[PDB]
Amino acid sequence: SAWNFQELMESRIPDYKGRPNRSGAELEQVKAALPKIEFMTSYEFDVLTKTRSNLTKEYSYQRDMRLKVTELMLDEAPHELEGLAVEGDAALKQLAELKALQTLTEYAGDLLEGQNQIVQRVNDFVDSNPVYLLDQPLREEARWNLLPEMDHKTRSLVRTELRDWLPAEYRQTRAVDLQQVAAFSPPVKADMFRAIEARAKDAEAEIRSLPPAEQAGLLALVKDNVAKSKAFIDPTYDITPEAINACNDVDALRAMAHRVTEYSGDARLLAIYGKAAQLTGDTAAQAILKEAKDLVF
């Protein structure tokens, strides 16, 4: 009592208890209070939440910064590529221009990295001083507890408030996945394909307003860009019901089923598997498919 070797805060040892002990009456009260629940396979959740397009899981503002920096860099490319002189033939001049372009892009990549680092530093500051950015009652619950040690409701409220304290261009929210939204909404994929075709036609016109050799090179580039953009939005866009009906190979149908299962696992699986069952006489599979189209899809 004459000494005191305390610390700032004693360590916390969890109390485990266990799953709740709900009696029959409580069980019935709970079950009568639940909504119409559909239990989902882990595969369904996986395909819903898989990483498809946002490979690096970059937030919105990071993608916006990258696109803005690309615009600014392109607006400055002709000035940097203008007037270059070097002793050599055409190929040597081309390599010199390529090196100049590379230097330009490496210059612009550093400014983008600096800005990403600055915004990350702002957000690091937000975390480092949470009690100074919160109101009651969440302030004390952020003061006494770490993120893993908070209640789920208080944890969510604290994190949302801390995120919303920032300006709109610093809030760290994941960017939309184009492939994901296209895969789970048939109209969105149609709109994206229409946009791709419109841009292709406009670019073809612009090219046709240019001298000959550039026309051929740029038209090849446009074809490649359209093909790869379509394969990016929906790799399985060629598995149409017409193609399924036209396919009479078991191995080919299995490949189609695998490709669809990787992508979205939609009713095209019903079509492919029905056509596979008919070609092989799988009555059990046909019954399961009936059940699936009744319930799964």
Partner: protein, 161 residues
């Protein structure tokens, strides 16, 4: 805004790194001079004034570091050092008691006087009695120090509560 470093007390440069050693050197040379010439090179009061003035730096730095640089890690370090210092003092007292009791526990002793019985009425309590040691006043001082200990413990606990 400031950048926060580790909890550890980084430390400051100070003049106490050489002032205290110079103070010890001064005291020991003062003793040597007093031994040699039997006189004081510098007045004892002036020497004690210098010694006191040198050591006023501790409370000032203590105040200004508690106001600014203190946390539980630093406090624990300081309290453990205090404990070790108390231990050293206890050992010093043990050594001096060893010095005192070395010739007293060893009962046999060659004495200038007689301590056998049946020769005089008082000889048989010559060796086992130093009857001038001011026992009554020693007990009074004991009472004073018990007062101090109990009062200080009471007040310490009272404020701590």
């Amino acid at each position: 805004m400031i950048l926060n470093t580790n909890i550890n007390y980084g430390g400051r440069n100070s003049r106490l790194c050489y002032l205290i050693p110079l103070m010890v050197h001064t005291i020991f040379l003062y003793l040597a001079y007093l031994i040699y010439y039997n006189i004081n090179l510098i007045n004892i009061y002036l020497l004690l004034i210098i010694i006191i003035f040198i050591n006023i730096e501790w409370p000032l730095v203590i105040i200004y570091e508690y106001i600014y640089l203190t946390n539980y890690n630093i406090q624990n370090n300081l309290l453990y050092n205090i404990a070790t210092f108390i231990f050293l003092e206890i050992l010093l007292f043990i050594g001096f008691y060893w010095l005192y009791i070395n010739n007293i526990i060893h009962y046999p002793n060659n004495l200038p006087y007689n301590n056998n019985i049946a020769v005089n009425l008082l000889d048989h309590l010559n060796h086992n009695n130093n009857t001038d040691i001011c026992l009554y006043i020693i007990l009074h001082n004991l009472l004073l120090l018990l007062y101090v200990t109990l009062i200080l413990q009471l007040v310490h606990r009272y404020v701590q509560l």
